[PDB]
């Protein structure tokens, strides 16, 4: 939120050169100065025969905004024969990638074309150039003898590049192996120690590189983006790359090891064609010394307010933990067609709050498609999804979109003011802009007023001009400041005091400053950094006892302070800014002495009480809990009375009950300060004697640990009085209960078989299913619907195998779906078979039992048993009374034996159901 | 069983003569 | 009369109309003291302000045009009209609503347009049987659904740049098949071949000339061709009042937007027409591919339907792409299946099988509710779409339009439209926010005050902070404010503390965070209710303790959506037909059904049970679906009597049942092989013998 937006350093380059397409900082070790690196991949060069070769300019930040080309290569095209160029540098986009370690400047030309040493071709292998101030080498790891779409001919290496901590270069090229993509890593020392200007295909020792894979991975574009960070034990940086056409166009992000190019982790997009992995960034955003992954999908379509797809773009924030696991959250764009995840740039700690910050850019968003950059501050919880600053492009479109924000580089304090700065490029208007961070100031103000309880009868103070000896009191106000980084040592604020702020709406202001005779006052304070809470004094007084209006409304004394934003960093006035989340004003209250008794002081008797009205809440659910509170003051007046309801870890506040007249609409609020969250409620200022307030507070509880047994609240009224200013603490307890509405459901498919059966002939020894009969399928389901879960339960199946030594439903196989093991007390499929009415219910038939052991079923989980059986037809065509109808009845029961919540009154749950298959005769 | 990469198309089925192995032929005369 | 109007509207006419749609105002000076001014019409009727002195507008929705729904698509007499009414005029009061309705009909013999994008890359060499004799195979199968058919077609390969183009040996610039020592054609981005005409003669001849080109990478980026064939309607020949079908046929996967950065192409697509007199996409080499969002927007504005005619190897792909461009259909292109000549007419059935409403230019202040009457007066709330329709059906949508507060502006005009059709209902919304009181006033100066009093709508409003009833409500007097008024009942404190009554009118505007109003100072403007840490769930403004939900949100907390997309299931019917959609989440109301869209129900009876209801109503004119008239909407599976039922060991599901006549009906249904669910019934049920 501290980037200076009115004094940005603006740099411009040639028209149509895409100046600003890529940016970085140059921090040479042999100079106390620092520079801006900006690529212009379409800039024209003095190179003979080379149209639009492209440049990389370094820009002096001192002043005058001078940008001058770095000379990596002044030569034209090398030759393979007399008139047969070996390479083609025209239109090579040199400078579309620019990275800089201390003194090394790696620039790349991803469209650089090459005529192989084998056949006349033009293959965009791409080249790079590593400059160490004096020496300039060429790095072209994709110019090997492996040349074609089949190999590396189209690798386009240097499309994306990055350095590691140990001077390893990470290089991406998305065209290797029929556009599978490729990562190539080389030590910087090997790049310069192995350079040989007479050798075109150089082998580097200690090279790490991915290899071609199966043709299914073609056209994935691995190496579109690269970033580095450690995601293992070692200190060595590991390789993060975006592969946005991977996985049927879902897009993916590959993380490779830094030691040996081993695969480590994989992220897969959620939506096709969204370009998940267009950009990646690694930085530690939650201050846990563990690098976090940021993946951008700028064409992501989410659901609008009406449920309609809109292209807003999505950035995926993935937080690393101690194990390999990643806690991943999502972050959607704000304007349609803005391409929100285009560039993701770490900022370091832009505010020096102790947590690193990041910037995301929607280069086609904003007014008139000018570009937007959102600054997001990190915190302990992870990233804060609500941006704290918006950087809005200034420049308008000439031929193509300005693309302000297409390229960004931060993390470097170029002004040396203690806070990192930020370069942003707009290659459509051929510009690059550097924003400087402001110094953040944390100011804490105090305001204390001598006696808060004012007696009008006590007038022990004179009065200038007329000497009437009126009642007076004092207003003391303190102001201290402290701020990291470079900052002037003394700051100048403009403090303003207001007396009786509730008034001045046209009513009468009841207190005035003594000498000034007015309720308003101003003063220029000047403090020094550190602690040293420097204060001040003033004298206000009350009007006459018979002058103003009334005595119950309190005197609110209001202080606000504003910082005169001169005293800046002397460099085009880099003026500071106050901490974002800090109150720019504080207020205290004075009361008039009234109805406080002969003791001249108000000593209240404060009482609080509360009943349950539910007395039990169930674990798995979100239960509405309404507490009925009675807050009464049976003593003298209570100044600034508030009800303090201290809620536990589990629940939170919903609102006050207003649907009933017997209860009150008390203004309440949810506070969090000082390690404890709680609910405050205004009981009246003052809370007069005999006042009995009654209201209800709706809540929502979710159990925290599965063995908790209760929820305890604490109720206390407190007031700003001197004596007897608090009520006794009352703790209400609500007991957790267990409720598991479990039910068992069954069904037969089919539920009837009509006799006779088509094409049925009695086989001597039946072999397949067709020789036995139709397929009767019984499906039994045990589903837990209630809130509470259970850990173990049993399930028993009774099945009619035989009747009078005659098979009925020959079980072939039984399958299970869920946390369940089943065992049958008789072997299933002994024969190794391949692929009125009369009830037969295992109480009059030979029963085959199946017993199942059910594990943990949660709030909406089921366990299902599938029983695939055959109708033994041979039986029903006999003196088994053919032309008699039978109802084949199976039953199933369960008993819940155990629950995960201990120390609780669990009671068992048993129920049963029955499934029938009515075989009968439709004709004679 | 076989296939090709890129803008690939099976050449021509005069099967048992033209394509070395292939794994199909039929309408419009193309290889596997 | 202690009502809401008498409380928050006594300031002026402007703020009185804004209290409730039920409030009225008395302009004239008939008894201008001791009487309420913002009371209802009838309470302002007894206390006689009866003449034009009463300012009381009423909200209305007048129909300005409603031509009758046409019967046929042949423009014999006047024109085709598939929506009625055509122009409603909406007149709205603050916080008021007024509901209306609209009828939509997919008329018969509607003229159809078919543009055909052909992949002319080398992979398609083994796939150009389809284009052969196309206009005959387009006419011979579309004639059954329409007369007046027009066809044209174009071709696309890929961007003619590297790394897509063969540029390396110069003889490959004119013959990309330099290798293989074969001959093919130079590549091109998008070539318009034949404008939409009615002669299949010139079509079939112009199609047979086509041959393949060649490039390097398997993606071919027809999305460049889709966009240009959509927004170059002047060159393509898209007719007004005709179904627009864009058929896309290709071999393999496709380039998407941002792919062109590999080619040095970093300019986003502008969705404009760039095909010129040469019939060539003149920006193919300078402009990136189009993104799905840009295609969808333009595909919907130009009322074009995209048909994906693709091969088996790639059908799952565009099937997954089609779910991102709603209303697009996929279809296999291989003689190894039932219908390939019926491919397009099968899709046009699917396109016309649903009617979904879309809104354009809706004012941000307005919020539209939707009922849906899709079948036999079966009103369904919250649906703006009816499905399962056939060409010829007619559906009705009931619409509510409500404004939160009211904006002061000219009249706006938004459009309510069926997806993919030219016909529309245009709603001219005007806001009746103010009375005829401000213009009718004397000048705001020199009136009741000592200096600069401003009044004369209904009452004296003199000076700042004072505003006397006559004039100069002043500092401490204990004058007219005697707690008579300034308290709803005189057994209560003064003006709902947070305020003290100085004169008759208490200015209680003690500067709490936010704002504060109300005659007795009872209104809040904050502290409405919180679902999360946000008031009104962040989706509603707080007005006197009550949440006024933003568009598309409802509920006392404004935490319940109006969306039904999260309710829809893969089959298309919401909650899989077994549950109700409430707050965008299916509440499954059916025994043993569960899941996000009630897709899971292993206890539910087998399909043999509902399909037999279709056997009874289609084949026996009998059963329950016959009584409710739902047989023609629910039973769309083609049923056939098959003379001693066929059977293969290839997943044939056999069902039997016994009808009212004690006869055993036996039938099987071959599950979707080409998506079609065909149902086969044995003739001669087993009936008893005499
Ligand atoms: C993140 O996602 C990445 C992308 O999904 C994952 O990368 C993928 O991981 C796979 C698992 O390791 C890996 O599959 C393995 O590939 C190698 C490649 O070696 C082959 O060698 C042969 C000749 O060079 C060829 O294989 C034959 O078979 C293919 C069909 O597969 C035929 O079509 C060929 O004509 C050929 O005859 C290949 O061309 C290839 O070069 C295989 O050797 C591996 O075999 C393993 O599995 C088989 C079981 O089928 C075992 O028999 C065998 O002993 C091995 O255990 C695997 O198939 C992918 O190549 C790789 N792709 C990429 C782009 O990286 C990554 O793993 C994942 N990481 C994490 C952390 O999740
Ligand atoms: C780097 O230097 C190169 C030097 O060649 C330079 O490339 C040149 O750019 C100019 C643009 O100013 C090109 O001139 C064009 O030429 C073509 C024909 O070759 C014309 O069609 C162009 O448009 C004309 O015609 C249009 C309609 O007929 C008109 O709308 C328009 O106004 C023009 O009249 C245009 O004249 C020139 O061809 C190239 N030369 C090359 C590429 O060899 C490049 O621009 C320089 N880049 C930078 C960043 O400085
Ligand atoms: C009648 O009204 C008068 C109003 O003027 C009132 O006299 C004032 O009372 C205050 C406090 O009640 C007294 O000021 C004090 O001064 C002494 C130093 O002599 C302080 O110790 C007091 O407490 C402070 O102590 C520290 C300063 O050393 C601070 O760090 C601390 O935070 C406290 O502020 C207090 O400041 C004094 O008697 C006068 N002051 C003035 C300006 O008039 C009188 O008490 C009233 N009497 C009755 C019977 O009502
Ligand atoms: C919006 O917020 C409200 C309040 O926070 C939510 O209403 C609450 O949840 C349900 C709504 O139907 C109510 O039901 C309660 O839960 C059990 C679960 O089995 C149910 O059986 C009981 O009937 C019980 O009352 C709950 O009472 C209700 N709470 C309040 C205070 O009204 C609402 O669901 C939220 N909507 C969305 C879309 O988030
Ligand atoms: C590449 O390096 C990694 C880590 O530096 C190696 O990973 C470990 O390898 C050993 C032996 O193969 C395994 O027992 C460990 O389980 C691996 N650690 C893991 C998977 O976290 C890896 O073996 C190295 N060599 C390769 C990948 O060829
Ligand atoms: C005076 O203090 C108040 C409260 O601390 C502030 O005014 C608003 O306070 C609310 C609640 O904290 C915030 O949500 C608003 O953002 C504040 N207003 C603004 C403009 O930021 C503020 O600190 C001071 N306001 C004034 C006018 O002096
Ligand atoms: C077992 O499940 C049955 C459902 O078949 C339920 O029985 C209900 O509960 C009691 C017991 O009869 C009655 O008051 C209800 O009317 C029953 N409902 C019926 C029969 O539909 C219940 O969920 C379980 N009951 C027992 C005793 O375990
Ligand atoms: C299969 O046969 C049994 C036994 O006849 C049927 O059970 C009947 O259910 C009704 C309630 O619907 C009860 O009156 C009796 O339990 C049974 N009826 C009679 C007349 O005894 C069962 O309904 C049959 N299955 C089907 C699908 O109808
Ligand atoms: C939309 O459908 C509802 C379904 O009941 C219609 O009924 C209204 O429902 C809500 C709350 O129940 C309220 O608007 C009214 O209480 C109901 N109105 C009735 C019953 O006439 C509603 O009218 C329909 N609205 C439109 C615009 O069609
Ligand atoms: C305070 O500062 C302002 C501007 O800096 C100045 O105009 C004013 O006179 C100063 N007053 C005092 C008392 O320093
Ligand atoms: C089922 O059996 C397996 C191994 O026999 C065991 O690991 C698992 O815990 C069992 N589950 C239950 C619910 O008994
Ligand atoms: C299509 O999507 C389904 C799931 O929706 C997935 O399983 C399948 O692999 C996808 N196939 C392609 C080609 O995208
Ligand atoms: Mn590492
Ligand atoms: Mn971290
Ligand atoms: Mn920070
Ligand atoms: Mn800085
Ligand atoms: Mn006392
Ligand atoms: Mn192709
Ligand atoms: Mn093909
Ligand atoms: Mn291609």
mmCIF file of C-alpha atoms and ligand atoms in Angstrom, chain A residues 558 560 584-585, ligand 6:
data_model
loop_
_atom_site.group_PDB
_atom_site.id
_atom_site.type_symbol
_atom_site.label_atom_id
_atom_site.label_comp_id
_atom_site.label_asym_id
_atom_site.label_seq_id
_atom_site.Cartn_x
_atom_site.Cartn_y
_atom_site.Cartn_z
ATOM 1 C CA UNK A 558 -12.164 13.745 20.280
ATOM 2 C CA UNK A 560 -7.481 13.352 15.494
ATOM 3 C CA UNK A 584 -6.164 8.094 12.909
ATOM 4 C CA UNK A 585 -8.204 9.348 15.934
HETATM 5 C C1 LIG D 6 -12.344 8.694 13.172
HETATM 6 O O1 LIG D 6 -12.466 7.372 13.692
HETATM 7 C C2 LIG D 6 -13.379 6.530 12.974
HETATM 8 C C3 LIG D 6 -13.476 5.239 13.758
HETATM 9 O O2 LIG D 6 -12.203 4.804 14.220
HETATM 10 C C4 LIG D 6 -12.882 6.316 11.546
HETATM 11 O O3 LIG D 6 -13.927 6.603 10.620
HETATM 12 C C5 LIG D 6 -14.419 5.389 10.003
HETATM 13 O O4 LIG D 6 -14.413 4.259 10.914
HETATM 14 C C6 LIG D 6 -14.939 3.040 10.364
HETATM 15 C C7 LIG D 6 -14.922 2.003 11.474
HETATM 16 O O5 LIG D 6 -13.628 1.787 12.026
HETATM 17 C C8 LIG D 6 -14.129 2.630 9.135
HETATM 18 O O6 LIG D 6 -14.715 1.477 8.541
HETATM 19 C C9 LIG D 6 -14.100 3.761 8.114
HETATM 20 O O7 LIG D 6 -13.247 3.392 7.037
HETATM 21 C C10 LIG D 6 -13.590 5.054 8.751
HETATM 22 N N1 LIG D 6 -13.632 6.153 7.794
HETATM 23 C C11 LIG D 6 -12.658 6.419 6.911
HETATM 24 C C12 LIG D 6 -12.890 7.602 6.015
HETATM 25 O O8 LIG D 6 -11.640 5.735 6.834
HETATM 26 C C13 LIG D 6 -11.663 7.185 11.247
HETATM 27 O O9 LIG D 6 -10.494 6.627 11.841
HETATM 28 C C14 LIG D 6 -11.863 8.637 11.712
HETATM 29 N N2 LIG D 6 -12.774 9.336 10.817
HETATM 30 C C15 LIG D 6 -12.877 10.670 10.750
HETATM 31 C C16 LIG D 6 -13.860 11.198 9.750
HETATM 32 O O10 LIG D 6 -12.209 11.417 11.466
#
